[PDB]
Amino acid sequence: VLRDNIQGITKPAIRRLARRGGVKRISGLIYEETRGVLKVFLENVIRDAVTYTEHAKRKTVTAMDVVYALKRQGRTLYGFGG
């Protein structure tokens, strides 16, 4: 059972992802906040993708099922079929 890899998204990774977002200064305690946001977003999309996966009687999560899982939530994704 994999455990405690929310620390895997490390502090300079969040730094780079915020610099792509156009930041100048990072709050020292915003890292946990962004981690929680990524948890809730990935939990929603992975729940939807797994529920797609269970309907196909499959036990592997497919990028195709992920794409429709994303575009049900209002955010379509390109580059992996449609």
């Binding site: 890899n5 895997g8 998204i9 990774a13 610099r19 906040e33 996966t53 592997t60």
Partner: protein
């Protein structure tokens, strides 16, 4: 020894990470994080490589859009530093919180 004024390296790496388009979070930590998130809904799941690339691209796109929103909300409050309350404000305005 030479040391830059704090504020210019940030803009330089803004230019670097906005000009480029490569993967920006490390692959294996995102692997592990998706494995722990997916194991709650159903244990012993398998993932295509294209599947976790799709999750990673969705994560980068969502968080860059949120970082746009928290930057512009932070400078709405006359601040160049982003606060977490900027993030809850942005997520509240977007309607997802």
């Amino acid at each position: 020894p030479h040391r830059y004024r704090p504020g210019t390296v940030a803009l330089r790496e803004i230019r670097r990470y906005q000009k480029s388009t490569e993967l920006l979070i490390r692959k294996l930590p995102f692997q592990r994080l998706v494995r722990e998130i997916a194991q709650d809904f159903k244990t012993d799941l398998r993932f295509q490589s294209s599947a976790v690339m799709a999750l990673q691209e969705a994560s980068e796109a969502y968080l860059v859009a949120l970082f746009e929103d928290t930057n512009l909300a932070a400078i709405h409050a006359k601040r160049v530093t982003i606060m977490p309350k900027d993030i809850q404000l942005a997520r509240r305005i977007r309607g997802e919180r």
